[PDB]
Design a protein around this ligand. Structure first.
Ligand SMILES: Nc1nc2c(ncn2[C@@H]2O[C@H](COP(=O)(O)OP(=O)(O)OP(=O)(O)O)[C@@H](O)[C@H]2O)c(=O)[nH]1
Ligand SMILES: Nc1nc2c(ncn2[C@@H]2O[C@H](COP(=O)(O)OP(=O)(O)O)[C@@H](O)[C@H]2O)c(=O)[nH]1
Ligand SMILES: COc1ccc(N(C)c2nc(Cl)nc3sccc23)cc1
Ligand SMILES: [Ca+2]
Ligand SMILES: [Mg+2]
Lengths: 440, 64, 418
């Protein structure tokens, strides 16, 4: 058992969910119709990939997923897309009027009309689970649905599934590909409302992903498809221990124990390597030492911040492919000598290591080279608070003039929800400062 | 020690239940407060529009 | 489907309305008989935003034609594409007085218009709202258009109300009561629309004479500008792209305070990607006869149409903001947003359309305020309005609300971050 249900909310979450499930299907040999010739257990099984796919009697492997959007445009492409037969129609939920980039409409006006249906659809999935570990919620910070409906959903899930684990992949806004001037407002509102209801949340800064595609993949002007293919590799690295078997495989929840020293401090920084074009990967194989080194180069982080000017509370290495503990330990030993890796005084300095032997897959037609080994580092550093500072600053510039606030008030919100949310973020930035001060 | 063991597990149940209760009550007050506010704003928009109908009756009357 | 319902009122409203439908129909591959003869299917992906589907795969514009004077629709039906319009959506009466359009003649006809509005609205999957084309200087589009807004808004308080409003200029029309009619319309627009494009006849004339060298510009030459702009500003509503827009997302992202909702459109060329960018922010390419360097940009929306390097557009839009940083309010981060669509307008390989919410729009309103007070103290021509039952207080209030809007635009031109 130990099933995981994925919930994809709004445009960003749905489209990133397409990239991820396509990748998962390629990694497990599941065809676009859901048939998996290597699964000899027809209709069931307790295999590792079964944490993410259920099986029908007719041999179809169905994602344990719900897609939700407050408008039909994006999910209609799943309904007509290459993987349409994979999903039962009841897993693809769409309203008629989107949130119009407004948290208040996602949480209150439009969102409340569909929340009950969504929770019934999730319930139909939980009921097919022998032991449900929890939920993975994919969504943007910036959209009206990703912010407002996600936080309404996370609230309801806490009520309906007690303290069952809730994890997030949250798309942090960037000016290069943003869609709305009010993204800072929706980010703070949803971060405030969700903080108590989420156990662990992986932020993905679109500017970091955007820079990596430009710098490392030579993509002149990255699209959502470019970003999402790279994002799905990182998501694949994180979920790979749940979906694959391995003697050296370490369960994500064992990493979670080290990544979350206090409930509110639950935002790991992800760094992924190697991201390299086919042209440059040719006749150039990156060793375990090289890809491990790349995890401490800030230009490979999913969030722009400077860990060199912050403090570590945890450091995890998730490898996949042709990697053995001997090489890893060697790589770490030289890194510790040559790099600025400072831990807070109250936490041990070791590096938790996990190795999955299944090597990384690439989507046909992508820009990523296929490589023999790759790594995702998850570290808890105070530096990630810089991402909160940038956003809280952008929120402050507008909120002092009350700019655009009338659109949220017109939907039923009150100014005190804005100030309350901003104060929580202020306390969060203060929390990250306190955990980095030495003991007395 | 047995007495202490079942007080620990009772405390866990009591915190988890209280967390579920507070969340359920919190968003019930939030949604109820949000419906009142939005309705007050739409009602105010209509009250001012319906005043423009009154002012247009008067304007036609002043013509007679 | 996210339907927009289009309404055109008065003489000016129907002329630019028809031209708008001519240009977008041509752009979407709809012929005058409603049949699709197109190349790309980007043309039909979101065609339901503006067109209704009919048997025989006929596409019928979701348009309502209104005027208190018959004949104006006669020209429409005989004009190009005049048979594409649904005939029941023609509504007509049988005089350049705002009060008659808003209070006397327009009231008689307004219910029959609302009946047609209801019919088109009730057959919508999810109504975005409305879009009105009209002049502010005549009687029907000005007075009846603004009444129609009030009545539609009363019946659809949760849909977006958007207008293309044609401002009067002494350089195009000599009718002396225009500053009265315009001030009274603005008094309604400030209170009852979510977005208004200021289509300024003074800017359209100055463009035709100085830039295009037309010594005697006609309403035909002026309205050719108006259709190019209207095609540009609707690009992201009608076509699929990286940002799928609607009227509410336009309002939310462009309107920082409810009353500051009057937009300066710009178009270019009237070319290289840096030239388009530079010309688009040029005061000579604005349809609102306001220098942007005399004010500050609260928000900006830009559409590039045609085949071009989007990387190059990204750099040039960043370049113009850095070199002109003082003209964008610092307390709204990232207040300039750019979209790109591949189909260009007819005849152009690449164009740029600009939508600015600039505090320099106060110049437009100041011009009309001056023309208004020049008459109001003289109480000149007031009897045309008091005769219809109006009281002076109304003229004072409309003037006083328009003066307040300018102060408010000046308040935020002057605000600072620190
Ligand atoms: N990485 C990535 N980010 C995306 C993608 N699509 C949207 N985003 C981000 O999401 C932010 C806006 O949120 P959206 O998800 O697009 O909006 P929404 O969830 O559909 O909610 P609505 O506003 O009601 O439409 C933007 O700033 C984008 O950066 C995507 O496909 N990939
Ligand atoms: N720019 C432009 N302005 C117009 C046009 N037609 C009328 N106007 C303006 O509208 C004002 C008169 O309004 P009018 O169209 O006669 O209103 P109506 O007769 O009640 O429909 C004048 O000040 C003109 O400047 C047009 O085609 N283009
Ligand atoms: C303030 O930042 C903005 C301004 C506008 C928008 N949206 C919704 C747009 N809507 C339409 Cl109709 N056209 C265009 S062109 C570029 C954006 C855009 C988004 C963010
Ligand atoms: Ca199996
Ligand atoms: Mg959306």
């Amino acid at each position: 058992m130990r099933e995981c249900i994925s919930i994809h909310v709004g445009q960003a979450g749905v489209q990133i969910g397409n990239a991820c499930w396509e990748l998962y299907c390629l990694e497990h040999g599941i065809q676009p119709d859901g048939q998996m010739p290597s699964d000899k257990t027809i209709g069931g099984g307790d295999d590792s990939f079964n944490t993410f796919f259920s099986e029908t009697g007719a041999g179809k492997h169905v994602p344990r997923a719900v897609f939700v959007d407050l408008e039909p445009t994006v999910i209609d492409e799943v309904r007509t897309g290459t993987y349409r037969q994979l999903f039962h129609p009841e897993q693809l939920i769409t309203g008629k009027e989107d949130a119009a980039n407004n948290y208040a409409r996602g949480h209150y006006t439009i969102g409340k009309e569909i929340i009950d249906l969504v929770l019934d659809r999730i319930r139909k999935l939980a009921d097919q689970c022998t032991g449900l570990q929890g939920f993975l919620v994919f969504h943007s910070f910036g959209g009206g649905t990703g912010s407002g409906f996600t936080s309404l959903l996370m609230e309801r899930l806490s009520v309906d599934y007690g303290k069952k684990s809730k994890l997030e992949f949250s798309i942090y806004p960037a000016p290069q590909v943003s869609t709305a001037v009010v993204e800072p407002y929706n980010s703070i509102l949803t971060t405030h409302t969700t903080l108590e209801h989420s156990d662990c949340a992986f932020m993905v800064d679109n500017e970091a992903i955007y820079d990596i595609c430009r710098r490392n993949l030579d993509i002149e002007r990255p699209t959502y498809t470019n970003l999402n293919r790279l994002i799905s590799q990182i998501v694949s690295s994180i979920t790979a221990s749940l979906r694959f078997d391995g003697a050296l495989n370490v369960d994500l929840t064992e990493f979670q124990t080290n990544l979350v020293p206090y409930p509110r401090i639950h935002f790991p920084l992800a760094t992924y390597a190697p991201v390299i074009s086919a042209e440059k990967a040719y006749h150039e194989q990156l060793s375990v030492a090289e890809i491990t080194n790349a995890c401490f180069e800030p230009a490979n982080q999913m969030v722009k911040c400077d860990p060199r000017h912050g403090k570590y509370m945890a450091c995890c290495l998730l490898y996949r492919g042709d990697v053995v503990p001997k090489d890893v330990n060697a790589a770490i030993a030289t890194i510790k000598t040559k790099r600025s890796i400072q831990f807070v005084d109250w936490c041990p300095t070791g590096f938790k290591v996990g190795i999955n032997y299944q090597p990384p897959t690439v989507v046909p037609g992508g820009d990523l080279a296929k490589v023999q080994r790759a790594v995702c580092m998850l570290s808890n550093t105070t530096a990630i608070a810089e991402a909160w500072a940038r956003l809280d600053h952008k929120f402050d510039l507008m909120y002092a003039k009350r700019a655009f606030v009338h659109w949220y008030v017109g939907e039923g919100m009150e100014e005190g929800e804005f100030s309350e949310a901003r104060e929580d973020m202020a306390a969060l930035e203060k929390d990250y400062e306190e955990v980095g001060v030495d003991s007395v | 020690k047995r007495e202490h063991e079942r007080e620990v597990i009772q405390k866990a149940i009591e915190e988890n239940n209280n967390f579920i209760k507070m969340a359920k009550e919190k968003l019930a007050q939030k949604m109820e407060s949000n419906k009142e506010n939005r309705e007050a704003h739409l009602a105010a928009m209509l009250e001012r529009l319906q005043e423009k109908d009154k002012h247009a009756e008067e304007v036609r009357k002043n013509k007679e | 489907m996210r339907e927009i319902v289009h309404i055109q009122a008065g003489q000016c409203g129907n002329q630019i309305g028809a031209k708008f439908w001519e240009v977008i129909s041509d752009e979407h591959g709809i012929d005058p008989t409603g049949s699709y003869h197109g190349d790309s299917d980007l043309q039909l992906e979101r065609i339901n935003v503006y067109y209704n589907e009919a048997t025989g795969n006929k596409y019928v514009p979701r348009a309502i034609l209104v005027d208190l004077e018959p004949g104006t629709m006669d020209s429409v039906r005989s004009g190009p594409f005049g048979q594409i319009f649904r005939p029941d959506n023609f509504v007509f009466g049988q005089g350049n007085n705002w009060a008659k359009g808003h209070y006397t003649e327009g009231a008689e006809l307004v219910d029959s218009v609302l009946d047609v509005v209801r019919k088109e609205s009730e057959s919508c999957d999810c109504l975005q709202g409305f879009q009105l084309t009209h002049s502010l200087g005549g009687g029907t589009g000005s007075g009846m258009g603004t009444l129609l807004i009030s009545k539609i808004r009363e019946e659809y308080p949760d849909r977006i109300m958007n207008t293309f409003s044609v401002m009067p200029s002494p350089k195009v029309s000599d009718t002396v009561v225009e500053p009265y009619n315009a001030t009274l319309s603005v008094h309604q627009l400030v209170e009852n629309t979510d977005e208004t494009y200021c289509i300024d006849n003074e800017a359209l004339y100055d463009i035709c004479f100085r830039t295009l060298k037309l010594t005697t510009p006609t309403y035909g030459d002026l309205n050719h500008l108006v259709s190019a702009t209207m095609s540009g500003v609707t690009t992201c509503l009608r076509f699929p792209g990286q940002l799928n827009a609607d009227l509410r997302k336009l309002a939310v992202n462009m309107v920082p305070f409810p009353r500051l909702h009057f937009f300066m459109p710009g178009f270019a060329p009237l070319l290289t990607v840096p030239e388009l960018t530079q010309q688009m922010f040029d005061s000579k390419n604005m349809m609102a006869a306001c220098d942007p360097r005399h004010g500050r940009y609260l928000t900006v929306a830009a559409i590039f149409r045609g085949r071009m390097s989007m990387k190059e557009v990204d750099e040039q839009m960043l370049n113009v903001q850095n070199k002109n940083s003082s003209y964008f309010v610092e307390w709204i981060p990232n207040n300039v947003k750019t979209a790109v669509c591949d189909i260009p307008p007819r005849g152009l390989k690449m164009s740029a359309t600009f939508i600015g919410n600039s505090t320099a729009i106060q110049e437009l309103f100041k011009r009309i305020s001056e023309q208004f007070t020049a008459m109001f103290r003289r109480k000149a021509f007031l009897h045309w309005y008091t005769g219809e039952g109006m009281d002076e207080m109304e003229f004072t209030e409309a003037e006083s609300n328009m003066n307040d809007l300018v102060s408010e635009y000046q308040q935020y031109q002057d605000a600072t971050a620190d």
